[PDB]
Design an enzyme around this catalytic site. Structure first.
Site, short mmCIF file in Angstrom:
data_model
loop_
_atom_site.label_atom_id
_atom_site.label_comp_id
_atom_site.label_asym_id
_atom_site.label_seq_id
_atom_site.Cartn_x
_atom_site.Cartn_y
_atom_site.Cartn_z
N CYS A 144 2.64 1.30 2.11
CA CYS A 144 2.21 2.46 1.23
C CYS A 144 3.30 2.89 0.24
O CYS A 144 4.37 2.29 0.23
CB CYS A 144 1.66 3.55 2.14
SG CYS A 144 0.76 2.58 3.38
N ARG B 27 1.64 -2.05 -2.94
CA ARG B 27 1.89 -1.64 -1.53
C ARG B 27 0.69 -0.99 -0.80
O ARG B 27 0.67 -0.90 0.43
CB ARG B 27 3.06 -0.63 -1.44
CG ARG B 27 4.39 -1.11 -1.97
CD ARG B 27 4.89 -2.41 -1.27
NE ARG B 27 4.81 -2.27 0.19
CZ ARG B 27 5.63 -1.50 0.95
NH1 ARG B 27 6.66 -0.81 0.43
NH2 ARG B 27 5.39 -1.39 2.25
N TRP C 175 -2.32 1.73 1.98
CA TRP C 175 -3.05 0.60 2.60
C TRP C 175 -3.66 1.19 3.85
O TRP C 175 -2.91 1.63 4.74
CB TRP C 175 -2.03 -0.47 2.98
CG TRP C 175 -2.59 -1.73 3.61
CD1 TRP C 175 -3.91 -2.00 4.03
CD2 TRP C 175 -1.85 -2.94 3.92
NE1 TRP C 175 -4.02 -3.29 4.52
CE2 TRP C 175 -2.81 -3.89 4.51
CE3 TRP C 175 -0.53 -3.33 3.78
CZ2 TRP C 175 -2.44 -5.17 4.90
CZ3 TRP C 175 -0.17 -4.64 4.22
CH2 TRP C 175 -1.09 -5.52 4.74
N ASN D 252 5.34 7.70 4.89
CA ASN D 252 5.18 6.22 5.12
C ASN D 252 5.69 5.93 6.48
O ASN D 252 6.51 6.66 6.98
CB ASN D 252 6.03 5.39 4.16
CG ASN D 252 5.45 5.35 2.79
OD1 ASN D 252 4.25 5.67 2.59
ND2 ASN D 252 6.24 4.90 1.82
N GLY D 253 5.20 4.88 7.10
CA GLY D 253 5.68 4.48 8.42
C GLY D 253 4.84 5.08 9.52
O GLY D 253 3.65 5.36 9.35
N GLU E 9 0.41 -23.68 3.31
CA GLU E 9 0.67 -22.64 2.29
C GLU E 9 -0.44 -22.67 1.20
O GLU E 9 -0.85 -21.65 0.72
CB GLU E 9 2.07 -22.86 1.66
CG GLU E 9 2.38 -22.02 0.41
CD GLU E 9 2.25 -20.50 0.69
OE1 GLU E 9 2.23 -20.12 1.87
OE2 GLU E 9 2.25 -19.67 -0.27
N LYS F 185 -2.91 -19.49 0.34
CA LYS F 185 -3.09 -18.97 -1.03
C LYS F 185 -4.55 -18.91 -1.44
O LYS F 185 -5.07 -17.85 -2.00
CB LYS F 185 -2.41 -19.89 -2.02
CG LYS F 185 -0.95 -19.56 -2.33
CD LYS F 185 -0.73 -18.09 -2.41
CE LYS F 185 0.69 -17.87 -1.95
NZ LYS F 185 1.04 -17.54 -0.57
N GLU G 231 -6.59 -16.35 0.74
CA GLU G 231 -6.19 -14.96 0.48
C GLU G 231 -6.73 -14.39 -0.80
O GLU G 231 -7.10 -13.22 -0.85
CB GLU G 231 -4.66 -14.89 0.46
CG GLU G 231 -4.13 -13.56 0.04
CD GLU G 231 -2.65 -13.42 0.34
OE1 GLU G 231 -1.88 -14.43 0.22
OE2 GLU G 231 -2.29 -12.25 0.65
N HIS H 16 -9.63 -35.74 16.14
CA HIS H 16 -9.69 -35.07 17.43
C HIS H 16 -10.67 -33.89 17.41
O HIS H 16 -10.74 -33.10 18.36
CB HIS H 16 -8.29 -34.57 17.81
CG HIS H 16 -7.31 -35.66 17.88
ND1 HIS H 16 -7.28 -36.54 18.92
CD2 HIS H 16 -6.27 -36.00 17.04
CE1 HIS H 16 -6.34 -37.45 18.69
NE2 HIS H 16 -5.71 -37.12 17.55
N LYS I 47 0.64 -5.62 -0.22
CA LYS I 47 1.81 -6.47 -0.07
C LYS I 47 2.75 -5.84 0.95
O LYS I 47 3.03 -4.65 0.86
CB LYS I 47 2.58 -6.69 -1.39
CG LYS I 47 3.54 -7.95 -1.35
CD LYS I 47 4.37 -8.02 -2.65
CE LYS I 47 5.34 -9.22 -2.59
NZ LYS I 47 4.55 -10.44 -2.55
#
Ligand code: F6R
Ligand code: F6R
Lengths: 608, 608
Positions: free
Chosen positions: A1, A26, A74, A98-99, A481, A485, A488, A504, A603
């Site tokens: 945030c 954020r 967020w 925040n937190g 990766e 990407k 997301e 398999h 993020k």
């Protein structure tokens, strides 16, 4: 945030909004601000959605006054709701934070029982009612906050305002970043200096335990107790450009195209005469690194993927046993510690809660030491590590990391060179790595000129809802990766596999509609990988192969070959990432998705 | 793939077909047989598709004669085609083979240049033209085969017939299994005794290098050179039931419901007086296991998933560093070997090519020793390991493993108990594990009685094309295994995540249509996992939570809670696998998929 606060002579509402726009990456689920005019009439506005929802509202009901605080967030718990949007109030007290307030629950019961009503389940309201209770005898806001802070346990940052006395803001740093911006006859505060660049470049970074009393004309910082401490103000070192997109349509786009320059910056001062130079670590680091018999890498998400690439490098090039583990699993297991083990965290932000918790656990478990590879000067992971090696990629704003990942690999490769030297291995290992690194920004500049063919390919993904990515050896985490990407930011259900695992079970997924993306450098695994690709094609998969020009692939109906320029093997994983970053970008454009702020996310995961 | 051969007085066509039906789970892309009557008129029939396609054809054109060979195959390279179906011919020579002719390519050029025409690109035709060339001077078939075999390099099994002389079959074991069944006045051969149970229970297992000359009345086995060797015939030890489904609709179903009994069999002789008993390993094994400082586990697919569960056990319970790696990646990397490292392979079949190649590499790399955990007596991995611990689960025919996975975990847990004892750790670790194991068949019997609620749930998956599975800690590889089961046999795109990884990107995938399956034992990770589940629900995911009855989950619109009976924590991963096996089974039924023979696959990947 993201938290912004402001105490000025001029109206601060626009400043607080501009602050939230800059911290939006954020958290973009909701936002709010509260502004008190000199008469103590306090106006609070809160909206669900991106900051623009708040700004729009503000344009209908403008907020006069010189003192205010603001938040963008967020939303984790529960569906986001305006009732939970910050700031929260307790009559005249107004709060953003925040937190996390770890003891939310006992404090809440105790305030309930003193007669408070809770409109939300946020920690923020807990802090608000508590400061209200501390003021009820009638002292100064500072006095109440000093009484209040010791009763709060957890990792959090808070800014607090009493609308009856709009002359002062209180802020308390206790686990989550706060920084004061110094203006001329006005002061500001934010959770990140990035929010304050438009009105000031002069910052005071609060250290944990600090409580700040801030007026238009003064900044007084006090420790745990009530004693004043001295904190030096400094000039910003961020770029003037910071959270501007420039000519770019997206931050992500800019950050992809910046990679050659970011990599050069990662390399500055660190290559000399065909050798790597990590003397910045200082005159006790070699002793340490020299004793390393095992490496444990800890990271989340894309920073875990770069650690997975480097595992192939550390074992095959420096001959050092290397394990890589996601930090949310590591931090709760009862692990068996190897003898002489170096803990390496990778983190762009340096603040990821699980990665940070891993590092803290590792002290307690008796590892040899810890090394941070980080993109953010002075973040938690950097200050709590024994050693740090900064990536120098510059601020990264795209929620999905691009330049952070590729500069992480650059630094990993340097440390591989250094360890191979400390162990007395073939001098050629270091030489070849340094030849690699030295070519790397130009090789990346050259891959970026393939952008137009990738943009053309992306149109095929318009009607697609799934994709598979395949790689082997050190390209296997490059597939991971690329799949991350793609899923997301485009929301296609993309999944990566080491190519050898399909027979398999996962090969059942292949039908005529499944696109399969593969990275194919011209190396000793090419023939083994070709076999895998044929297994996929034989069952009707649609192949997209980013392959070296001389790999010999034959293009056809279900075989789309994107020819790649030659590259040094040692840097091949970094180079082959770039086309997958571009493809994800372009597919997201075709899908019409919010490339820079993908849904359900924000993020940096700084609260577990 | 599967090979059957037969040399009898009676017609053998039905026998060869019944043989292929029984080996079908090994490859069901095509099949063929060739039968020669006493007059040397040879009839060959080959069909694309399951064995029933061949049987049907055979019913239209019946094949008389006492000598024949047959094959059913998993087509890897290229789309399956009737042109490539076995047996292959070179005029009068007719051949079937399993495995691989590594030097296919030079032999082919050389035969081309001698004047042969190739109708296919199979290795089988190479062997056929070569034996034809060896016979061209006019010797016996045996003579030519002895000349032919040394020119073939690779891991393969072959049966060869000269239709001009239907009195003798030649077979050569060189890397891939062959076994002769002894009848009365007739003999048979197969790649697995399972194909021959309906006509004989008396077998001669060929050892590598063996060449067999087989008539109605005699079996002569010769070594590398032309010298006769002695091979003892033995009585089958397989169950009389073998590849019969009994009352079950599918093999997979039977094998899921057999788990309590299979587990009991895994435990027989191995628990005594509150302690584990692995004395079967012999009077040098403790010395070895006692020196182990690190464990490397190597496996593929579901056998890799059980190794991933045991990593949590080995580190947290026996305090031994443990890494788990998929074998297709391990076998080609240049790895850093830990000091005093035990190599453990897990494999149901004991023949998986990549796992086997890992074990072979490990000898060369200087590990302490190797331990096989295997379901098949006398398979490659068992005979090449220093130590073996058989699972005793019985023959497994479902292409997707169920009982193999859960009996693997049972044995892993025993070995965890043993190592914790050899290291002198708290005696309670062993006690608690043995309490676990002792309850385990009843706990599984009890979970199987939840089948009806799972069957009802599965109907919700009828319109679904994706699913996410979530777990933490030692349940995280249980999510992996449930997602693999679901995608392999229902073809829904199922993907597993350690629950802590979603906020780093994969949470973007959640919308109102995504079902999310979670395993939730009532343990110290429950509250941390609950947080994850809430993050998913908040963005509109459809939750399916298999949770302990006292976990306190609250059922709702998008929260479907399947309440699970209490279970000992140490066996909780094995217990929570069972509902995911049932769900995969039932969803496949709803989707109308071939549960036992899923598309694009076959069971056991014995050629890379
Ligand atoms: O950027 C992405 C996704 O593309 C995230 O997976 C992260 O890499 C992650 O959340 C770790 O964040 P840092 O520790 O690197 O700050
Ligand atoms: O059964 C399954 C899928 O459900 C396969 O993933 C295997 O486990 C695998 O192919 C390893 O085979 P084995 O080594 O165990 O014979």
């Amino acid at each position: 945030c993201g938290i912004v606060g402001a105490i000025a002579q001029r109206d601060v509402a626009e400043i607080l909004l501009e602050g939230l726009r800059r911290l939006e990456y954020r958290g973009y689920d909701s936002a709010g601000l509260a502004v008190v005019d000199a008469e103590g009439h306090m106006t609070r506005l809160r909206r669900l959605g991106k900051v623009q929802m708040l700004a729009q509202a503000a344009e209908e009901h403008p907020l006069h006054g010189g003192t205010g605080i603001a938040h963008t967030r967020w939303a984790t718990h529960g569906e986001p709701s305006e009732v939970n949007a910050h700031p929260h109030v307790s009559e005249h007290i107004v709060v953003v934070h925040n937190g996390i307030i770890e003891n939310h629950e006992p404090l809440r019961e105790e305030l309930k029982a003193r007669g408070y009503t809770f409109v939300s389940e946020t920690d923020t309201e807990v802090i608000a009612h508590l400061v209200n209770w501390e003021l009820k005898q009638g002292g100064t806001l500072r006095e109440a906050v000093l009484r209040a802070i010791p009763q709060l346990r957890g990792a959090y940052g808070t800014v607090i305002m009493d609308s009856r006395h709009p002359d002062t803001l209180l802020a308390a740093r206790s686990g989550s970043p706060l920084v004061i911006g110094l203006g001329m006859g006005e002061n500001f505060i934010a959770s990140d200096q990035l929010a304050l660049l438009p009105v000031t470049r002069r910052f005071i970074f609060l250290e944990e335990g600090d409580i700040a009393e801030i007026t238009r004309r003064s900044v007084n910082i006090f420790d745990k107790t009530g004693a004043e401490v001295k904190r030096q103000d400094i000039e910003s070192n961020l770029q003037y450009d910071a959270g501007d997109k420039g000519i770019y349509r997206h931050y992500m786009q800019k950050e992809i195209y910046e990679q050659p320059n970011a990599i050069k910056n990662t390399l500055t001062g660190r290559i000399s005469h065909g050798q790597v130079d990590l003397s910045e670590l200082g005159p006790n680091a070699d002793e340490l690194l020299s004793k390393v018999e095992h490496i444990q890498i800890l990271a989340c998400g894309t920073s875990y993927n770069s650690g997975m690439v480097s595992r192939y490098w550390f074992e095959s090039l420096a001959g050092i046993p290397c394990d890589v583990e996601i930090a949310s699993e590591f931090r709760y297991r009862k692990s068996a510690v190897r003898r002489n083990s170096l803990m390496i965290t990778l983190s762009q932000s340096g603040e990821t809660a699980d990665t940070l918790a891993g590092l803290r656990l590792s002290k307690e478990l008796g590892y040899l030491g810890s090394l941070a590879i980080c993109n953010v000067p002075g973040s938690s992971l950097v200050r709590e590590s024994d050693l740090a090696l900064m990536t120098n990629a510059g601020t990264e704003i795209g929620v999905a990391s691009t330049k952070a990942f590729t500069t992480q690999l650059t630094v990993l490769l340097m440390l591989v060179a250094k360890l191979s030297k400390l162990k007395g291995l073939d001098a050629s290992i270091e030489h070849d790595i340094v030849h690699g690194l030295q070519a790397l920004p130009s090789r990346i500049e050259q891959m970026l000129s393939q952008d137009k063919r990738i943009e053309a390919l992306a149109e095929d993904f318009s009607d697609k809802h799934h994709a598979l990515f395949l790689g082997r050896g050190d390209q296997y985490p490059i597939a991971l990766e690329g799949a991350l990407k793609l899923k997301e930011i485009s929301y296609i259900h993309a999944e990566a596999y080491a190519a050898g695992e399909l027979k398999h079970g996962p090969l059942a997924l292949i039908d005529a509609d499944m696109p399969v993306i593969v990275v194919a450098p011209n190396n000793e695994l090419l023939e083994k990988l070709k076999s895998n690709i044929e297994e996929v094609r034989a069952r009707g998969g649609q192949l997209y192969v980013f392959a070296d020009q001389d790999a010999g692939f034959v293009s056809s109906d279900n075989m789309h070959i994107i020819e790649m320029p030659h590259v040094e093997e040692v840097i091949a994983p970094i180079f082959y990432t770039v086309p997958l970053q571009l493809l994800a970008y372009h597919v997201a454009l075709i899908k019409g998705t919010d490339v820079d702020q993908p849904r359900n996310l924000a993020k940096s995961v700084t609260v577990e």
